[PDB]
Amino acid sequence: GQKLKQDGDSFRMKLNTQEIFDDWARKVQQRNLGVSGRIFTIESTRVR
């Protein structure tokens, strides 16, 4: 029983989830997504 419980606890620790949430939030902050600016943009492209 204790062997089973420690196997389950170790698997659950390996099964943690908040780290990915923190990483995604950090990436969102680093990239700093936004929409503020012009209504639409006109740009330059040399279409083949």
Partner: peptide
Amino acid sequence: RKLVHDKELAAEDEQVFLMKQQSLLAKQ
């Protein structure tokens, strides 16, 4: 005095309008 149709509707090719609006967006 038979009147003739005046200047017709122009095309104003999209490229010219687009570049003019590039300029306007640049200076705004």
